[PDB]
């Protein structure tokens, strides 16, 4: 079990809308995905060690929902995003990331 090809899965999977390959595998998060519900992600680099995995990323998506208070823009928005992953036995146990959320501000108008 390739940790590092598991993520590439995970990305391929919601980038496609996969519900299944998506279970295979497994806050703010929920900030994003209301107000940048289409939000698709780029890989950009992938590091595989033991359990954990860490990618840098961009995530595209268009402002149609209510971003922390300011109003839905129809803009759309570029976000660098890294994070780091935890694999047991080939599915996700945890996550950590961090996005550049200041930068979303900026991209929408405040």
């Not at 900030?31 to 680099?45: G, K, N, Q, V, Y």
């Not at 995995?53 to 928005?77: E, F």
């Amino acid at each position: 079990p390739d940790n590092k090809a598991v993520v590439r899965q995970l990305i391929d999977a919601w980038n496609n809308g996969d519900i299944n390959a998506l279970m295979t595998f497994w806050a703010e998060m929920r900030r994003f995905l209301d107000a940048f519900p289409d939000l698709r992600m780029e890989l950009h680099s992938i590091v595989s060690e033991g359990e954990l995995v860490a990618t840098r990323m961009t995530v595209h998506a268009t402002h149609t929902g209510a971003y922390m208070g300011i109003p839905p823009t129809g803009r759309p928005v570029s976000c660098a995003l890294m994070g780091q992953l935890r694999i047991v036995d080939g599915v996700v146990v945890d996550h950590w990331g961090v996005a550049d959320a200041l930068g979303i501000l900026v991209q929408i108008g405040m």
